[PDB]
Design a protein around this nucleic acid. Structure first.
Lengths: 69, 136, 41, 72, 139, 60, 175, 89, 114, 63, 183, 55
RNA sequence: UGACGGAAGGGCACACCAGGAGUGGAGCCUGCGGCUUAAUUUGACUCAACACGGGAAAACUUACCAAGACCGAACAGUAGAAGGAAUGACAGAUUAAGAGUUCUUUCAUGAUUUAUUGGGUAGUGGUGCAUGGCCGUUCUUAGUUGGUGGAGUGAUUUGUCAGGUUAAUUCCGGUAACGAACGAGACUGAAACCUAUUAAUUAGUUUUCUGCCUAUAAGACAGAAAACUUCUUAAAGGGACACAUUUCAAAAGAAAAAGGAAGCAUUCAGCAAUAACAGGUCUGUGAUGCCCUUAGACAUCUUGGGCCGCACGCGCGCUACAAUGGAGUUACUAGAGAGUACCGAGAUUGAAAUAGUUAAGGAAAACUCAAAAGAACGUACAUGACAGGGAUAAAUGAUUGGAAUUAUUUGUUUUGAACGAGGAAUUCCUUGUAAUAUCGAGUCAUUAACUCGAGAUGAAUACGUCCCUGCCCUU
């Protein structure tokens, strides 16, 4: 269950601009993504919100190479 | 009790029950066998060997005189019989005789069905390219 | 081949085997329990 | 009375139902029109079939192209 | 637990047996016919009419408007007399239609405009006979 | 007459097609590590049986 | 098991689903679970469940489980007659006895996993019942019943015991 | 003749029960006029007594197989006496 | 006072009605002790008014099991898992769709080469 | 082709005109075979009198 | 005199008063297809370019049955190539001119496939691609507009297939798209 | 006359009495839903009619 | 650069392994080869030909054969010609023919056309090695490319890779490459849930009134009425993304377990790139080029036959070889389909059955439309070609059709054949799947042993490896 670059890049692009809005909770991130990035598919929104949350655990623990917010 | 009976000059087996021992007659099958048991009023479950020759002379009479023993006409192996008479009367070794002469009647006038009997081919018009391949 | 005669753990199969009688008769002796098998002791 | 609408597009009859609305939009079961055909025009090739289906949605109420309405 | 309201409270097979001897003039084709076309042997039971008459009567108790055809497909078997795969076929009509006609003579069944129905007293005797088998079942 | 052998870990799977497992076993009687080939579905927690323990199965 | 009804081999107790959990003990061997969707999942199936599903083979008996559930029920009662013991208890000794502890693979001698020991134990007993009852007077349930009780203690006349000894001997000379 | 067809086969009396076709009645009308051999493509006639003495040729596929009607060759079809293939070698 | 509940199998639906009474269980009007396949009677038994209108004959036996199991919980909650999980959750498995080129869902017709 | 005299003017009096290509049946309007209509006016297109577009086994004539 | 009795009526199945719902829409779809291909053969010189029930007939309809996005239209664009090809213009220049017409007309991407006897007696097929174009997915069921036309030359028939990828105006969006806004 | 026997054979039963609407060929017909459109002709125009390759 | 290797390295697939069901052996249905005939029309011949051309052919289809007729010879010019170009015809003969085809015979209608030169036209005629379109295949796996940049004189190469990971050039990572596009993914349909929303008929439930019936006390049935939405139908939403714990691999990820209706991309499908075959179809087409035939036709039509012909060979399948069964009686249980003037056919009634005479409702959640495998019931059958098997035949009874012979389909009695689980070889398959038995639809005047779908019972064996057949990358 790896993630394509269309959702890894999309997840990255949201975090650099919109870090404080996002949090460790997955269910809140679903609600934000529907408003802060116009995605026409529910399944695609969840996958990005799935990875965006997953990036927070690494980001909270420290810096990460790809994302610079 | 006998393991070997005789009726209408045909040997049966005494181990079988009365309806399934009367199939040994060439003209009698399974539906016909049960009927003559009911007409003769004998117990089906009782075996053929136990059954006394007092009933034999009636069963053979019934087999040869079914029309007057209240048997439906649509139960008869020979309906609208030619050569006079309109009744089966075929419960005997007479099954082969009528069958043998019917082909010869067809064969005499060179009827196509009769011709297919001469060559020993499929008679009722079926594909013979792949089936019925007994080597000759 | 067997010719196990037709006139004259308990199962009609075994009481037809070494009694040398047909299994139809083996039902008669056990009578004098289900419509699929007759098991007696 | 009885207003019946049947169409091939679900968003069509649903849009017109809410516009007419009043008794609720009852939904008679959807009909599917399945047709199976061989892909090839001749016999040669692997046995491949394609599955075509057209749906028909029916709504009945009691008081655009491809949509029909009748009043009983 | 258990209680009695109608014929659904007794096992079907032993009610028909119970309603068999209670029952109807016997025609001349009783012993010369099978119960259909798929079958090939006449019934082994000497009194197969009565055991059939009870079942046909019982089916009326549950279906309000029932016809000859609905019974023909009910008392029907499979047709596998050749190499073709077996396809279901209808039962016999004359045996069931005659027996249904006979129940009209007794008055157990009636004639609705879309089938046949049990009469008032037909409900009584059926309910009566269904009871002892119920009582016998409990004991 | 037979001596049991617990399974410690799986070495892999060999024998041309994969239908024979190379496992390491420790006989509970004598805590001796013995290497054998196993035929069938096996797991680490499983306990085997052995009617012969002098074949140090290695396949060279 | 039918409102009517210990493992010596320490290598099969964990893989024998008899009474370690309450989900195993059941009034009928007709459980519709998904026991073949993950590896090592069939070990959750009750032992009588596993035996019944092997009485449903040779094509024309495909899917008939109520048919196979009746013969097993009648077989177990006969088993209790011949052994005055618990048919479930009697059966699990047969699996221990009728299990080949070695096999030859291309040959080469290798042992047999405990899970494979159970699968072959039922498979070998199953075939003997099918062969014995085919074109024979004895009812299938009876033929299965004495097969198990013979396979129970040591009896060689049991088909599974004959096959186990044959394959064990072949492996012995294959070393 | 309508009475005789009753004692024939089930197929024979049904194919006579349906109304007489114009081709067949126009055939027997010639059969009364003639005996001289008469050819026809009609392999659908039922042998009836009104044509016992006639000599008639039946188109098999390419020729006319002359057959003289016999009283022993009754209601069987008239086309059964003109084979449509050389049998076998 | 009553509650409504139901249980499902492959296609069998058994809509129960759990309600105060003397304990009489009835399926489609027949007593629970007079179920048609008498082998399955003890499997169903592992005032209710159950109505089964789908599936086959072994599917409905499991659906009825759900209906009795679910009804007790629904009645008790408003006013099993350590033994059999499927007593309270429907089995999701359904018949797969046949595809062209084969007689089943995965089986394919035989091939010939020479 | 040979057509009835009262028939030929009836088509011309009616003449747009359409006619099926199936020659077994008659024309539903004039009650005449679709053959006669086809052959009579297939000759009219060569005189540039009409247009002879063909579509779905029906010939549509429109000059 | 003729011995004919059959009669194939010149009617339509969309005028039937008593018709089932399953039969109603099938006849509605069939009649549209028959009508659409009828006037396509008439209005070829005008680019009929679609019908609903073009880029000084009604009598034909009763007897038988009883655009600003010119670049985006594939039917009219395909007819432009067919007219030019039949006019003796070389396939490379003529098709190139049509592609530039579409590209400046506001299309995400388009592709014209020409297959036939262009070079000589041996057949050949050339494919011209311009702009972005997806080939796989359910998206191409909504973002496509194509027409299949065939032209007749002195040596044979040349097949021309013209397909155009539309834009957001046919309401929707492609599969992969995030387009994150900023604050 | 010259045409009295022409097409005098009655074709009312139908395998040469049914024709595809456009192609006109007599083999491969689809009489379902009154289409009367044989294969190789319905496949081309299926999308126009309304049928789609769904599942 | 590509292809190939009885070269290496790394991966993958029912490719094999552990297995299930098998086919091959018997009878029969069907296709192909062969032989025969006047014809037994023809395309396709390894996967990618052989229940394939939706090809279940009595007439038509029809392409072949024997006869017979016949123009479906436009348009233009000539001849002829309303004092008749020509067309049709009862009766006799000729002809299978009620084709006036022709001949003896005169009777009707009237330029609608006969003979003429060009010329088109027509064709299931050839040519898929002249083409379009469609399809199959390479190839169901993961591959392909151009814009600028670096290298080479050049074809060309890097980008498109060491390692790891993934179903996947999918990513982490790496870096003379950077930024992209297609392909995968993303996407669409079905299934897996909603006691929350929306609704209530043609779905269902509940309640009430009337009548009737039995119990020990609850209910049942029938005829009505008028309420609710759990089921049913179906719209919008919600709902899983491996998020989240443990372990393993500062990273992509992997493996249990719990929770969940749902956790292999959740499953089954659909769509599916660049390049290519001189792979199938001009016998699907009023799509077509060229060649061929063109009034004694290879165009068209009628009649009869053939595609069904059997010394043998091969492929797809059905039924069987029985007691895990056959025969008789009883209760039963679905899902998805289809239906008009005439189609799907209820109820009544004639009978032994197929079927017949009258006959409601329904353009349909309303009416028709209906389950068997399996289950239960007996002092039935008892292992024997037996009552397993139902071929082959003989009599007879009905339907469809203009027509049933070379049996269209089917009923009753009788007839009782090979077949005792099948050699070398070989096919399909990993979960509601295989297998088994059945239902609907396509074709359809009448005809399934086929195909496309639908449910109903529900196995065993793996959680692996390249050994075979093979792919895909890299030296």
């Amino acid at each position: 269950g790896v993630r394509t670059k269309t959702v890894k890049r999309a997840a990255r692009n949201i975090i650099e601009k919109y870090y404080p809005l996002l949090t460790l909770d997955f269910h809140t991130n679903k609600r934000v993504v529907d408003e802060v990035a116009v995605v026409e598919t529910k399944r695609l929104r969840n996958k990005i919100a799935g990875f965006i949350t997953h990036l927070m655990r690494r980001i909270q623990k420290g810096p990460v190479r790809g994302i610079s917010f | 009790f006998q393991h070997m009976l005789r009726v209408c000059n045909t040997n049966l087996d005494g181990r079988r029950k009365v309806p399934y021992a009367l199939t040994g007659i060439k003209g009698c099958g399974r539906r016909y066998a049960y009927l003559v048991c009911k007409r003769a009023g004998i117990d089906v479950n009782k075996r053929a060997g136990l059954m006394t020759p007092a009933e034999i002379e009636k069963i053979v009479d019934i087999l040869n005189n079914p029309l007057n023993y209240k048997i439906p006409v649509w139960f008869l192996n020979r309906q609208k019989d030619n050569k006079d008479g309109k009744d089966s009367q075929l419960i005997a070794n007479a099954v082969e005789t009528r069958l043998r002469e019917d082909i010869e009647a067809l064969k005499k006038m060179r009827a196509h069905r009769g011709l297919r009997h001469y060559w020993g081919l499929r008679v009722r018009g079926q594909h013979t390219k792949t089936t019925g391949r007994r080597g000759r | 081949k067997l010719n196990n005669a037709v006139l004259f753990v308990i199962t009609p199969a075994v009481v037809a085997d070494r009694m040398k009688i047909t299994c139809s008769l083996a039902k008669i002796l056990l009578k004098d329990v289900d419509n699929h098998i007759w098991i007696y002791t | 009375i009885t207003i019946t609408i049947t169409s091939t597009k679900v968003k069509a009859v649903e849009s017109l139902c809410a516009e007419v609305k009043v008794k609720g939009p009852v939904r008679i079961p959807t009909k599917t029109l399945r047709i199976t055909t061989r892909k090839t025009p001749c016999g040669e090739g692997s046995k491949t079939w394609d599955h075509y289906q057209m749906r028909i949605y029916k709504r009945v109420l009691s008081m655009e192209p491809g949509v029909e309405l009748e009043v009983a | 637990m258990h209680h009695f309201s109608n014929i659904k409270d007794v096992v079907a097979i032993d009610f028909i047996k119970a309603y068999a001897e209670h029952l109807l003039e016997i025609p001349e084709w009783v012993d010369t016919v099978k119960t259909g076309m798929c079958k090939e042997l006449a019934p082994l039971n000497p009194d197969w009419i009565y055991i059939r008459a009870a079942a046909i009567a019982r089916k009326v108790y549950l279906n309000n408007g029932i016809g000859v055809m609905a019974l023909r497909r009910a008392y029907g078997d499979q047709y596998n007399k050749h190499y073709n795969p077996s396809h279901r076929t209808l039962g016999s009509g004359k045996v069931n239609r005659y027996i249904l006609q006979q129940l009209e003579k007794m008055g157990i069944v009636a004639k609705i405009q879309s089938g046949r129905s049990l009469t008032k007293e037909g409900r009584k005797d059926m309910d009566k006979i269904a009871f002892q088998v119920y009582k016998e079942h409990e004991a | 007459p037979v001596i049991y052998a617990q399974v410690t870990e799986i070495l892999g799977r060999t024998g041309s097609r994969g239908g024979v497992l190379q496992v390491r076993c420790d006989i509970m009687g004598e805590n001796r590590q013995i290497l054998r080939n196993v035929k069938g579905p096996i797991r680490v927690g499983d306990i085997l049986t052995l009617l012969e323990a002098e074949r140090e199965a290695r396949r060279l | 098991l039918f409102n009517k009804w210990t493992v010596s081999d320490i290598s099969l107790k964990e893989l024998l689903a008899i009474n370690s959990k309450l989900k195993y003990q059941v009034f009928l061997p007709h459980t519709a679970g998904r026991y073949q969707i993950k590896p090592f999942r069939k070990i959750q199936c009750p032992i009588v469940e596993r035996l019944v599903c092997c009485m449903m083979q040779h094509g024309k008996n495909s899917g008939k489980k109520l048919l196979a559930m009746r013969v097993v029920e009648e077989s177990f009662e006969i088993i209790h007659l011949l052994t005055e013991k618990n048919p479930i208890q009697v059966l699990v000794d047969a699996i221990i006895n009728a299990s080949p502890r070695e096999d030859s693979t291309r040959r080469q001698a290798v042992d047999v996993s405990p899970l494979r020991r159970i699968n072959q134990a039922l498979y070998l007993m199953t075939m003997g019942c099918r062969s014995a009852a085919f074109r024979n007077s004895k009812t299938l349930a009876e033929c299965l019943a004495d097969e198990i009780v013979n396979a129970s203690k040591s009896n060689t006349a049991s088909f599974a015991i004959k096959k186990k000894e044959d394959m064990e001997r072949v492996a012995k000379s294959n070393r | 003749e309508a009475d005789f067809v009753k004692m024939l086969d089930a197929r024979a009396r049904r194919s006579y029960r349906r109304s007489p076709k114009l081709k067949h009645e126009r055939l027997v009308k010639k059969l009364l006029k003639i005996p001289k051999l008469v050819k026809t493509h009609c392999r659908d006639k039922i042998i009836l007594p009104n044509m016992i003495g006639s000599v008639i040729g039946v188109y098999n596929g390419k020729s006319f197989t002359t057959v003289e009607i016999k009283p022993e060759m009754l209601g069987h079809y008239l086309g059964e006496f003109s084979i449509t293939y050389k049998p076998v070698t | 006072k009553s509650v409504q509940v139901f249980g499902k199998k492959k296609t069998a639906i058994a809509v129960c009605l759990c309600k105060e009474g003397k304990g009489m269980i009835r399926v489609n009007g027949v007593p629970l002790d007079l179920i048609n396949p008498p082998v399955l009677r003890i499997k169903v038994f592992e005032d209710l008014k159950i109505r089964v209108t789908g599936g086959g004959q072994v599917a409905q036996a499991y659906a009825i099991r759900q209906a009795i199991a679910k009804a007790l919980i629904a009645y008790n909650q408003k006013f099993f898992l350590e033994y059999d999980r499927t007593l309270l959750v429907a089995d999701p498995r359904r018949c797969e769709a046949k595809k062209f080129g084969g007689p089943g869902a995965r089986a394919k017709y035989q091939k010939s080469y020479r | 082709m040979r057509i009835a005299t009262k028939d030929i003017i009836a088509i011309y009096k009616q003449l747009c005109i359409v006619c099926h290509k199936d020659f077994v049946c008659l024309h539903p309007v004039f009650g005449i075979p679709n053959l006669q209509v086809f052959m009579l006016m297939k000759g009219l297109a060569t005189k540039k009198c009409v247009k002879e577009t063909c579509n779905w086994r029906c010939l549509y004539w429109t000059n | 005199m003729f011995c004919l009795t059959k009669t194939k009526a010149l009617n339509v199945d969309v005028l039937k008063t008593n018709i089932s719902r399953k039969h109603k829409f099938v006849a509605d779809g069939v009649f549209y297809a028959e009508l659409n291909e009828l006037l396509q053969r008439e209005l070829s010189a005008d680019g009929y370019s679609g019908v609903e029930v073009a880029t000084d007939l009604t009598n034909l309809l009763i007897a038988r049955f009883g655009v600003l996005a010119r670049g985006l239209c594939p039917v009219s664009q395909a007819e432009s190539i067919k007219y030019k090809i039949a006019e003796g213009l070389p396939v490379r220049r003529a098709v190139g001119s049509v592609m530039r017409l579409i590209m400046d007309s506001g299309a995400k991407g388009c592709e014209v496939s020409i297959s036939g006897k262009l070079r000589g007696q041996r057949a050949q097929g050339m494919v011209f691609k311009e702009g972005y174009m997806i080939k796989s997915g359910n998206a191409t069921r909504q973002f496509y507009s194509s027409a299949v036309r065939c032209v007749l030359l002195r040596m044979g028939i040349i097949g021309i297939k013209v397909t155009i990828m539309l834009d957001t105006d046919p309401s929707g969006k492609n599969g992969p798209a995030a387009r994150i806004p900023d604050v | 006359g010259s045409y009295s026997i022409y097409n005098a054979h009655p074709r009312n039963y139908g395998n040469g009495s049914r024709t595809c609407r456009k192609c006109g060929a007599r083999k491969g017909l689809i009489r379902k839903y009154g289409l009367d459109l044989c294969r190789r002709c319905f496949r081309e125009k299926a999308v126009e009619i309304g049928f789609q390759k769904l599942d």
